[PDB]
Amino acid sequence: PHNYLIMDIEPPKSVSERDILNLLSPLQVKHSFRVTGSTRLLIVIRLDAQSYEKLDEITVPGKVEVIPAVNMADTMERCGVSWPRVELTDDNVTLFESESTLTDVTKEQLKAMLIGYGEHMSGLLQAHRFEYYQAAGATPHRHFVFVNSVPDEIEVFGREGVDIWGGPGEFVVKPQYVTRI
Amino acid sequence: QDLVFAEWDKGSSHEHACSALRNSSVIEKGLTVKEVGTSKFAAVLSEPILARLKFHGLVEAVPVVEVGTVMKRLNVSIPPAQDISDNNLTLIKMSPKLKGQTLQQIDAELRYLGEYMNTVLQKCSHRVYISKGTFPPKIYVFLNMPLDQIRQFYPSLDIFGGPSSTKNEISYVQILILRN
Amino acid sequence: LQKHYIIYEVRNIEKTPEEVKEEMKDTDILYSFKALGAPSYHIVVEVNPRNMRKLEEVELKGKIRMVPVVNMVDVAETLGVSWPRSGARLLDVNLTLIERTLNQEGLTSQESEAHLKGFMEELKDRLQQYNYQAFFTIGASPPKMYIYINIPYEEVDKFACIGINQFGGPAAVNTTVSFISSFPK
Amino acid sequence: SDQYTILDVYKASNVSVEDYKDLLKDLDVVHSFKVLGSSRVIFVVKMREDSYEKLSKINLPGDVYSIPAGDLSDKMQSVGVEWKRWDDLPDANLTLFERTLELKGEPLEGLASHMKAFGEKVSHVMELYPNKGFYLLGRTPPKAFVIVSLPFRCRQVRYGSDFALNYLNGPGDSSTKVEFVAKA
């Protein structure tokens, strides 16, 4: 099971996608995306020992958030849910950022809801190429979903298992069109 | 099926027909228990058998189904363990207050509770019934378990939201009729 | 060996205390208390095979609540607290019953255990100088605590409010005080 | 300083107030109020050292509740509020207020602060009219019985119930029940 680092970057006006030279050259960059219509960037980095050591000579300018992450398929497999393990295609991609907003929830209740969401999505993930990244160690629960962009499928994918998490008022889902590199 | 969990309270009446609950020719293929030292009686009976009784003080009559059926409907396997006996027989009534919860959320919580009880109650004779079409749902568990271990079931309340999301009643019962 | 008990809360306005006592047949009774001037009774019975067999002939009438309980020193031992040794006999002089029901709304099991441990650590020192018997519900939610204590009446009020904040304040607990005596007289 | 027992009695059939007073003739019954229009009667018994045994030998018929209680003026003095203590009640225009406090999410100190402020606000009116107050000992939610003689009683009932209610966190953090009583 791999460990990852998700960089959400809002660079200064002066810096123009030279962040790739800062990052891609010494690090193992798994994915590079730009939020369509903006200058915000989202970088998925695989944290091997070399990349982790090299990160301490790197400073990304701007408003940057760095989220340790895991492949949520690994978590589902550990919890007994089987998900397809298929690499994400170079086709156009939609990103869903999801966060739990419930204030009254137990650890066991949260695990039950997570397992239920995994079981519910298991059937509908067979016809798609996707990657789930859960923010490791972050509470409340938070994850990012990179899924192949199918027209007239954003509403279906976002509105799926929302009721398992507590309903439309207790689960924040933000779909975003992203452009590779 | 058509199982009903019926609970009667005959504290007010000093004479009643609840001796029928010990009458094997009235109760067939059912279960009847009496709360120890109390005028409270309970039964799980098929609807035709329940139609034979016209007791006065009826606390409740909830259509229920055996957990095995519920777990099979969710493709979850729970062995039926052994049959309950009269030694250490305890009735646990669990009523979650699913405040601010959805139907899929309670379904996921019920599946998780089933998975947890699968290993927790694997070595004790029990009978678990779940209400049908009743909201908020009710769970009845005849557990025949060591009294010291009763407190170990406390953390299960966490599955539905914590100790005060769930009303929990514990009582000691005596078997009168147990027929299959 | 842990001891388990049943507390019968009896409300019967149609029977004399002698008849209420006779309703228990040959069951061995640990305590039998009646609220002063009121038809409210508490019968505390130890759970063992002999008593369980004798209770088969008992059918209490009226408004009855049956509560399985454990001794609070057992709860103390499980939580790591050491409560003072309870008294065997509860005399009629200065006898008082304090009942607490904890709301516990919005908490988890671990959080509730932490609160209970805090309350018990707070009450442990005050309980030292009194002759008491305390019981806690086993499995019931919301939980209920019973204290039968020989305490001077002028100190009852404050004593009933000790450690209330450990459970979230007065709105989070139901506290009831009764003057009781052994029955039948 | 003084402890009391409030016997709240719903009279059994064929049992009159006089019968109940006869059953308690050996006890120090300081007050006895009968609710007009119902079968409820309240006996306030001043407890002495031998009062508890005598009360333990007495079984009152009907639905009876025995509630330990203390003087409300003593409690108000304990929180630093000055309340006039009346010797006796005028036998006319008597009105009983039963108030239960439900201060959700407050610690004991917050409830004490609300009660101190409310008592300070209401002490002047309490000094105006003869009254006797009791509170339930060690009882949570806190509960008080106050019998006050009200001229202009009909509108004064609403005025007294509503008076300084914001100091008790408004009309939703407490419950009030009003009765018309007569000396028994």
């Binding site: - | - | - | 007009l36 229009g37 079968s39 009909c154 009932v157 609403r158 509503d162 009309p171 939703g172 009003v178």
Partner: protein, 179 residues
């Protein structure tokens, strides 16, 4: 002025209740249809209270001091039509209000808004309303003469002023006015 006292009697017959209360001045008396339930509103004066202190009410009785809602509305500056209640289609709405996290100012402003809203609509109906005097939670007994097809409308008029149907608990009962 002097308001009233409401007696809610359950396990007694009309003849028994009329036999007692014989010297008591009665403002209004109704019996729930099909039910052993009687509501007797009696005037609060010295003679009535003195007589009530000496009689036993048959059955199970609960007493509640009540104030005529017309008088309260006039006290807060709203003038209700005061149409005399009739013996046709006598319907009792019992409403309890849930004030949670409300101040006294909000309670009074909501009461004023409701009074203003229903003032023009009461001119076409005969009614008699009483409020539990000094009681919290607030409780209102509203007797109206109205068609049985209007029960949902009448109960829902202004329900949002007090917070909506989840905050005001209403029950409806058909009654007979006992002359």
């Amino acid at each position: 002025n002097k308001e009233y006292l409401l007696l809610d009697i359950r396990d007694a017959t009309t003849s028994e209740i009329i036999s007692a209360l014989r010297d008591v001045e009665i403002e209004l008396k109704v019996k729930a249809k099909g039910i052993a339930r009687h509501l007797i509103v009696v005037k609060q004066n010295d003679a009535n209270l003195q007589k009530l202190g000496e009689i036993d009410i048959p059955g199970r009785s609960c007493s509640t001091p009540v104030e005529d809602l017309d008088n309260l509305m006039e006290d807060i500056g709203i003038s209700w039509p005061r149409n005399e209640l009739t013996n046709v289609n006598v319907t009792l709405f019992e409403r309890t209000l849930d004030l949670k996290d409300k101040t006294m100012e909000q309670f009074w402003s909501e009461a004023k808004a409701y009074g203003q809203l229903v003032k023009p609509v009461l001119s076409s109906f005969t009614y008699r309303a009483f409020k539990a005097n000094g009681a919290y939670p607030p409780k209102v007994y509203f007797f109206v003469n109205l068609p049985r097809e209007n029960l949902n409308d009448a109960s829902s008029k202004g329900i949002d002023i007090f917070g909506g149907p989840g905050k005001a608990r209403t029950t409806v009962q058909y009654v007979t006015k006992l002359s």
